[PDB]
């Protein structure tokens, strides 16, 4: 159903090439750049993402997010709408169809999990997180694409952005870093990775940054998190950390 930009319901067992063909043939153009990202709306976080979206608009870059009205993604969608009101930005939210509070079959209309309407495009996964694999596969395939016009040598650049914590953030970072081409940028967990850049230091940083998340997590979960962080740090030459025109500088340095 077309929410009222575009909203589609694609099952988990979907071909990334088919999605790319659908998005490029008659929806959007080749992407010079592509980036994937209650919350603390601090001025630093309020300005860094504004600069990021301005850079994406300047370069015509795709932005990929979860696509929910609750969280920082709502702020991103609002900023996108404001800039469009002020050569169009492209934002894709990805979520699970079952995870949606309400489901409508269709051009159906959606009226207020709750999904934001600011994002231009939205995808729903029919599994019963279940969209991480699809997003990672799509990012890898796009990195596999060749665009001679792009200044980046050969393949289209891709950048991963980290701002918050949680097991989902670490899982996504580990999945992306498992792919050599993608590179990560760090804005709780962000402070952990910034401090780290063997087990004692990681444990101390994780405890200091997230007093409650570590407490709730079992010992096995903590060990798995430490393993993921060690794997991510082993490839530190890709990962970059921002020091607490800096967003563009950091992205360019990482690329």
């Amino acid at each position: 159903g077309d929410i009222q930009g575009k909203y589609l319901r694609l099952s988990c067992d979907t071909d990334s090439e088919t999605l790319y063909e659908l998005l490029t043939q008659h929806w959007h153009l080749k992407t010079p750049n592509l980036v994937i990202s209650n919350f603390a709306l601090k001025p630093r976080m309020r300005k860094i993402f504004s600069r990021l979206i301005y850079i994406a608009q300047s370069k015509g870059a795709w932005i990929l997010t979860g696509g929910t009205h609750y969280g920082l993604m709502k702020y991103i969608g609002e900023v996108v709408r404001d800039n469009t009101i002020s050569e169009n930005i492209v934002a894709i939210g990805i979520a699970a169809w079952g995870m949606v509070s309400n489901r409508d079959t269709l051009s159906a209309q959606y009226i207020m999990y709750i999904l934001d309407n600011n994002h231009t495009h939205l995808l729903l996964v029919d599994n019963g997180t279940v969209e991480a694999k699809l997003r990672n596969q799509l990012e890898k395939y796009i990195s596999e694409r060749t665009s001679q016009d792009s200044n980046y040598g050969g393949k289209i650049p891709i950048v991963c952005f980290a701002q918050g914590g949680g097991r989902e953030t670490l899982k996504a970072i580990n999945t992306s870093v498992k792919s050599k081409i993608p590179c990560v940028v760090v804005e709780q967990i962000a402070d952990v990775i910034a401090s780290l850049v063997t087990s004692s230091m990681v444990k101390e940083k994780l405890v200091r940054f997230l007093p409650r998340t570590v407490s709730r997590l079992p010992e096995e979960e903590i060990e798995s998190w430490i393993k993921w962080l060690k794997e991510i740090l082993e490839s530190s030459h890709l990962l970059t950390v921002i020091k607490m025109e800096i967003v563009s500088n950091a992205i360019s340095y990482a690329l």
């Binding site: 209650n38 919350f39 603390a40 709306l41 601090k42 001025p43 309020r46 918050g164 914590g165 709780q188 007093p211 409650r212």
Partner: protein, 436 residues
């Protein structure tokens, strides 16, 4: 805060910690300690804290609350707003507002007075009402914080400047008036800078916003408030002057040389076949040329010169006890002028009469009509003599009026204003002269 945190019962009660920090005005400590991603922050939970911060003059805490997921539009309920206007509105400021309303009335201050009375005895723009409340009490930081959330930012700034200026003209207390005056100047500067940047970024949108009328902030646009407040600095900016020039020239190209336009005016056929160089078919070109305000003004001054020449001709060389055709024609022409004058008076009669040139032109009509009435009586020779003398005085006043045209010229306009000021001073100087 340290003592209360370690109490075995206050650890979970973050609301009490926030309340205490707000009471003691600890911003950095609250931001670093309690405002964290550990727990969600719902607007309803924070509504009471926001109200308390508003009451006790805590602007930075208000800003922090607004940043951390607070919907100010939903918070400002009618009951909350009326209670705030009734209980926490100082009686001294209400007395000052009454004094200003009774003495220094205005088309705007009456609106805010009616709004205050409505909210006090028992809305569309709650943010505007809150901004007005903050302004009337000379709260600077809180007013800026509320202004940052308003839609008509420059319009709100202009309105606040005008309201503060009209409030400061009162003399019940000097300190409050001076504070309001400095705040008004500050808001005027903010509006000027913001609109300068706005026009620099883009041109058409800035003009649309400037001419745009809101959903009755005060029943006026930015330009009307600026002129009413005599904000010479704001309306003298290059963007506003360019907008005025575009309106004045109209569809005609802004950059074409003037002598070309003059020759096209005198010579009709040359207009459609050459150097006119319109900004934007042939009939369209001609109609656009003849609808331009500048061409209308030039043709009107030409017509007025012809009218004055005919007036001299008929008041000087052709007069008899019986009417003659030139006199009747002049009567029609003066009737046309009177119709235009009454059309002018129809809009903002009090403010229209407040104008200087308006006083002179309005005065001329009464003398002219009196003289015309006296002339008709041909039986009495003395009445005819008096009527002719009054007609001479009418010629004098009309020729005095004719000088207003030079305002259009950049090189000549200021001289007329200098002349007006010189008149104002020399009147008193020659009064003393005549006394001694």
């Amino acid at each position: 805060y340290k003592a209360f945190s370690t109490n075995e019962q206050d650890k979970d009660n973050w609301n009490g910690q926030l309340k205490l920090l707000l009471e003691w005005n600890q911003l950095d400590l609250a931001s670093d300690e309690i405002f964290t991603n550990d727990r969600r922050w719902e607007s309803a939970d924070l509504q009471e804290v926001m109200f308390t911060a508003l009451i006790k003059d805590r602007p930075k805490f208000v800003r922090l609350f607004l940043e951390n997921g607070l919907n100010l539009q939903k918070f400002l309920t009618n009951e909350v707003l009326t209670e705030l206007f009734s209980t926490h509105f100082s009686t001294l400021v209400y007395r000052n507002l009454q004094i200003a309303k009774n003495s220094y009335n205005d088309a705007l201050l009456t609106f805010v007075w009616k709004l205050v009375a409505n909210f006090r005895r028992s809305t569309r723009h709650p943010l505007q009402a809150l901004f007005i409340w903050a302004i009337l009490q000379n709260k600077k930081e809180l007013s800026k914080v509320i202004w940052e959330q308003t839609k008509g930012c420059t319009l709100a700034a202009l309105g606040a400047s005008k309201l503060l200026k009209t409030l400061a003209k009162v003399k019940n207390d000097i300190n409050a008036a001076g504070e309001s005056e400095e705040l008004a100047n500050e808001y005027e500067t903010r509006a000027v800078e913001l609109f300068t940047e706005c026009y620099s970024n883009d041109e058409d949108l800035a003009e649309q916003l400037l001419v745009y009328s809101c959903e009755a902030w005060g029943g006026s646009n930015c330009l009307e408030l600026a002129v009413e407040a005599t904000d010479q600095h704001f309306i003298a900016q290059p963007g506003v002057q360019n907008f005025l020039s575009k309106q004045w020239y109209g569809e005609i190209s802004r950059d074409t040389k003037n002598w070309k336009i003059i020759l096209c005016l005198f010579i009709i056929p040359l207009v459609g076949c050459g150097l006119v160089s319109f900004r934007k078919k042939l009939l369209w070109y001609y109609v656009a040329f003849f609808t331009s305000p500048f061409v209308v003004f030039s043709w009107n001054v030409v017509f007025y010169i012809a009218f004055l020449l005919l007036f001299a001709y008929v008041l000087l060389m052709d007069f008899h006890s019986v009417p003659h055709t030139p006199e009747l024609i002049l009567y029609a022409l003066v009737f046309v002028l009177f119709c235009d004058e009454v059309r002018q008076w129809y809009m903002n009669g009090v403010n229209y009469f407040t104008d200087l040139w308006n006083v002179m032109d309005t005065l001329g009509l009464f003398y002219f009509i009196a003289g015309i009435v006296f002339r008709l009586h041909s039986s009495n020779k003395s009445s005819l003599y008096s009527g002719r003398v009054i007609f001479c005085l009418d010629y004098i006043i009309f020729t005095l009026r004719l000088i207003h045209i030079f305002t259009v010229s950049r090189n000549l306009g200021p001289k007329i204003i200098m002349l007006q000021r010189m008149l104002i001073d020399v009147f008193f100087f020659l009064f003393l002269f005549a006394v001694w």
